[PDB]
Amino acid sequence: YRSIQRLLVANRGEIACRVMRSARALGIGSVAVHSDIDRHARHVAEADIAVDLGGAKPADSYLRGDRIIAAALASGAQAIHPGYGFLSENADFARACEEAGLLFLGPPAAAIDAMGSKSAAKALMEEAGVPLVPGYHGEAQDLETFRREAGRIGYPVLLKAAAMKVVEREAELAEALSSAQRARMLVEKYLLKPRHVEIQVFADRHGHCLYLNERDCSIQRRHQKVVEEAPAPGLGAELRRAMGEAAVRAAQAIGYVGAGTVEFLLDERGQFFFMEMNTRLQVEHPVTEAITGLDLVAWQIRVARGEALPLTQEQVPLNGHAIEVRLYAEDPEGDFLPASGRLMLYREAAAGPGRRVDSGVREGDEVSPFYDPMLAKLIAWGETREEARQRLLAMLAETSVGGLRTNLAFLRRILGHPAFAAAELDTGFIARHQDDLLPAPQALPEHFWQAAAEAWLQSEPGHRRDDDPHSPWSRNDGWRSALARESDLMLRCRDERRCVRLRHASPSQYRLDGDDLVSRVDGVTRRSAALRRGRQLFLEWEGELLAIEAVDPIAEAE
């Protein structure tokens, strides 16, 4: 039994804070490492000790194993957690840790580069009884061998070469074959509306291994998990234990030790195929923890120390439903591009029932163009799936982010999409409903400018002079003698500008407390977000944060 006194977390952002929280929960000290850019980061801040690594690019910063392990030796860390990304999956680094006496909360180096090759991994998988996507490389016959090959591979089959021709019937296989240009043809099975189902595997040193239910990660933005959930909405008990056992046999196969997940893919027809196993902890791991009450990082730490998994498979719980969403600094209707800037506004959503949020940022922080733009992960748990969904949706309503372009408006729509409620999931969901997910702006109504004006005007007190502190002249009132209150504002939202003239012989209409604009459109009292950060007023309007500011005649004239 070894034992960690200080755990070094060789990573950054959300995940670094994430692991660090679990360490702390056990009385274990935490060590962070940072590039020069993250010198003033949150993960470095919440760390008991930090150590400066490289400079800016991950290439010569967080990827510098030798320095990371050096740091660990110097800062007195007895173990290393690599979190996901970076060096979490490359035996070289896993071995170098071994060649240092450092425990490595990960799978033994072997399993790593073994699963790192499409080849040998395809090998070990078949051996353990893990279904693989029927294919047919090597040989490339003509109008006769393919017929037999294709026949077993299920007929909804594809046709490639050596660098598509979707065959649907054996009767279409005829012309399907006589097509070669630019003979040499491959027979790879094509999958219909396939859901991405992975299984959370977790072993220990004592040969025990188990799967902690499965997660669906179908909704993906041009390859890249955007939403995750556990359990997988559709499949029942049998299908679960089938894929779980498969994954468990897959891990037993390469003698796995830590946490990792087997990433499958199952069509509309229930057949599930191995795609690849992640020899690290999964990003979307929170939804699993949600429905199981388990701290996978704690577990991750315990096996490292060499203890035995606290449960048997008959005990792995699975109650309720939890949905996870990834908040990025991407651009919704902007071809999704790593928008890196400054977080002028960043308000997370209050603690509340099944609410969880694993972030790595805070207001004022800069989103550098050197790392994954993931701001935070919002997770909601619910008894039913509607609950988790409706809760998660509320967490997205109560979250605002300004100073950057965010995939937040996008995510709000997804959870609030009839398609998503109905669980009509497959890995093409994103590109399918894109028209509803990535709309296009509507100039804003006079309904809006009045609201924005009121808001701004009320976020701009009036200057109280020490000379005369209670001067009625400090009113942002608009008071006029016999006529009605007049206030005129030159506002500019986005790349548009209006000259809102506020008039009201009726003091009512709008008020504003904290970060809430309380409006009264004759009869209906509604309240929305209105947050002032600097010379900017971020207003919540139709589920989209709009930045408003005053026009500066001088600035621009220049």
Added chain:
Amino acid sequence: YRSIQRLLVANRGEIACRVMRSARALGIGSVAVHSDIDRHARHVAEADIAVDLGGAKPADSYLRGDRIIAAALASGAQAIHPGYGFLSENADFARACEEAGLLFLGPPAAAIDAMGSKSAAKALMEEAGVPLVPGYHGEAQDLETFRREAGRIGYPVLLKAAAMKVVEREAELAEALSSAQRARMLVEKYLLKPRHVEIQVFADRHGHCLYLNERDCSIQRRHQKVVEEAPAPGLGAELRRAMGEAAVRAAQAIGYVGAGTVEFLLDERGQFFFMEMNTRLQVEHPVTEAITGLDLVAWQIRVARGEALPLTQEQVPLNGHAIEVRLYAEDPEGDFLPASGRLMLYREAAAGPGRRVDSGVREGDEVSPFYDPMLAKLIAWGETREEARQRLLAMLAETSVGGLRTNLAFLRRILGHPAFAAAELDTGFIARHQDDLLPAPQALPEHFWQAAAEAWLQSEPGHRRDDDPHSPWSRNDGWRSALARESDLMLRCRDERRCVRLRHASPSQYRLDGDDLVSRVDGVTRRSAALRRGRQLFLEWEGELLAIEAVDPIAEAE
């Protein structure tokens, strides 16, 4: 399966906030509606969206169905919860909601007006095997038919006509009959020291139905529940399941769907009789939730959405004891009258163990003369009943309310009454011990004025002038040269006034921090409430809040 996005709560005060909290807990948006008087109310405040209805009287405000349903359509509510009171029990409104596509978290309109008639309800009840209070209308014979009738109705029987003559023995029935004036005689059973026991029923759409234990609501101020508890102190397992099944058969009878309770009545002899069923959620519902860990409003919402009750009767828990008390703006020793004014002081009691408080007010709020004067409901849970009682009592000690007359001093006495500890309950408890519950004032001792003075004097700093900020002249000290500290105060409590002269060559005695007056009556250091709100000092004295203020020679001389 339908599904609520926004839930409109067609009600106000405590219950409105109550339901709204559950909605929010599920990620469901909430819509409020208000009269013009409640335009600035707490329930409107804690609402995601509010809508102005009528004006002042419930008649043309919260009772205006057409507008309430209009509001719901306009504000985007997919369902309506009517809470208790108002329109929560009248098929007309329940149907109008149906004729709008709105889900109505309540029983189907049928059961409503069916149970709304003493007649037809008496019908359906007998049919389902629900005991009714033996009576004898219709026929009115003389000295012979009554003998047989009375004989079955149990002899402790009453005698009415067509608009009392308590018969106790068959041998007294003789003269009991020859009395008619102003022949036409009715034979209705009389009940001895009857406890009010109701059962919390809750069905769904799928025909399932169950009872969630029972509640005793015996202690009533001239008809009106004042205290409630669950479970009913006396009765055991058999009696519980008997009344429960009875109530469940009663609900199955009219095809009930939501939440509701069957209100029974059982004498000293264990026989229980149906009185009426409430086709809504019960006000005193918190004590039930307390001993069951169930959110009846959540459940209420779920059946509306059409899900199935999450439990079977073998699972309905029942651990511990919970007591509920109703805080009103009534007048203890003032013939109990709807005292409507301004809440100058309103301090609830800190969160603590089994403590719960469902209110609908806050300091500064006005208690209008248009609605039920219920301020809040204080609920305490305990393992035993003494625990709940002692805790609840502590919550009443730590609660202060000034600017109005309150039934709070009254309630404190009830929980602290030997009769109530001993569970000597029957529906006459209130009018019986009235002498101990509604005492009569004692002028206050010189013991008091000294205390009040010290308090006031210490709630009145001394004016620090910007001219000279640390001036020793700001001391509320009473400093005198060689003699002892002299301070004289002209105080007036209630309709009495004293000229407290504070002298002390001993700086000690009293001090005051926050809302606590710490006194030291030579040897005994005691601490009580002393809260300053405006030109008024509310002091806790002998379990009764006393308002104290300074006498104004000018004001009155005028």
Added chain:
Amino acid sequence: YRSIQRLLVANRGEIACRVMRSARALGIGSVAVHSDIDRHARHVAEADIAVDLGGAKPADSYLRGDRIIAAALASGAQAIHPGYGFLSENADFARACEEAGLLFLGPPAAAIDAMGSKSAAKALMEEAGVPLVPGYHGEAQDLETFRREAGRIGYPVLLKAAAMKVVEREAELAEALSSAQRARMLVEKYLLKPRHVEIQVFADRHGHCLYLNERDCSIQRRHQKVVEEAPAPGLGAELRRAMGEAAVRAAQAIGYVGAGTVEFLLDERGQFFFMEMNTRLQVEHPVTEAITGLDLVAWQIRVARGEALPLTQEQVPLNGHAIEVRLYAEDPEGDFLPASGRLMLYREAAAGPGRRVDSGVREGDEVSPFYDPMLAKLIAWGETREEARQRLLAMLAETSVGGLRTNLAFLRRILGHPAFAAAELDTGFIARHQDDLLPAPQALPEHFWQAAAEAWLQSEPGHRRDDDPHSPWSRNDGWRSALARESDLMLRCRDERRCVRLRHASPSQYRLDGDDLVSRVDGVTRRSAALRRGRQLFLEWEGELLAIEAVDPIAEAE
């Protein structure tokens, strides 16, 4: 069934606050009593009512039964809890309470003075089948009787007289006997590396009795429990139930009622012997509560009221591990002496997972030379024992205490000692590893003074004058014209003084927020405690709080 309305706690410090918290948790009012010195104490502060007793020495203060019981009658207390120490174990006081109608949350007076005599207690114990340490008083033969006596007493035996000669073999017994001077010889069994294992017993009035697992309290500073844990690290199920039953039979024996523990002693050989039973609640009781989820004071209160223990022995839980440490105002490397002074600095460690802390002090409080110098008890719970240990260690890291000498540095070392992790426990542990537990100072490195200076300088702003509030002259910067920032400080730590000269053409290095000094020793960002209290700066350095202050040329020259 009697019932407490107000509970008087006849004690002080931590335990008084401790019991008072449980009372409050049940809605039970609490009454405190104090000496004149504790007139402004925390336990008196957290009390609903307090009563002045004696003056300074416990002799004529908390030990004055007559006054304590008088107080209880006067303050309206229906019961008395004596906590540990003082009068918690002396039938005289227990009887006097009886002769007053006061419930006494303790064992019936009988058991008290019965267990109070080494004699009669040795009697009752043998009768109930409770092993005792084999001895041999009365008779004192020569070279023949001892041989037989010694033979049964296990040969690792001692030899005393009437006021040591450790015999190890029967073959050594020869010369072992012919030694008498200054015949009259006693034969008492000697124990090898004995662990101190006591069992938490708890009965009621209804004859039921049970043991709530055991606690190990081996690590003791020259007789005096310093560390405690539950369960006892080594022993298994059989040994547990054996000692438990023994203790239970011991309590049944004298007809015990409340809480108490049987203090055993078991050698390396597994044989356990009775030492004495405490007829009160144990100080170290929190570790037991930790691993059982039980409030022993609540229980203590309930049996007093005459209820029946809520569990059977098959239910007494035992999950996880909890370690308790006693924080005293002793002197680590100062021959352990009751250091009584003023708590200039007292910061407990934040609420966190298995964290618990039962204290009786607060910053500013004076540690009088009249009572047990125990500041607080820090308890950490963990799933495994390493967890509890590592957590508890973190609680000791996050705890600072200045203005006195504290056994805190000592305790930190114990939990962080390889010997303690390995559970190498026996009652000699303290005096054995003393060399590692009570080191000796090392003057502090230039590494330190730079740190202390920076800290001090940064805890000393610069004086902002109302005259000119933003004056750049307020910088504690060290700004110099063309050269580098110069700041010179005359600091004095302990009885040493340096003239730290801070120079930095690099603004970086140190910063300071809250009570954290964030340092950057080129590459490694570390953070430690630095708390300013008055003209003193308490810095955390190498797990030892160092007091630093500025040298005053005038003060000393004088």
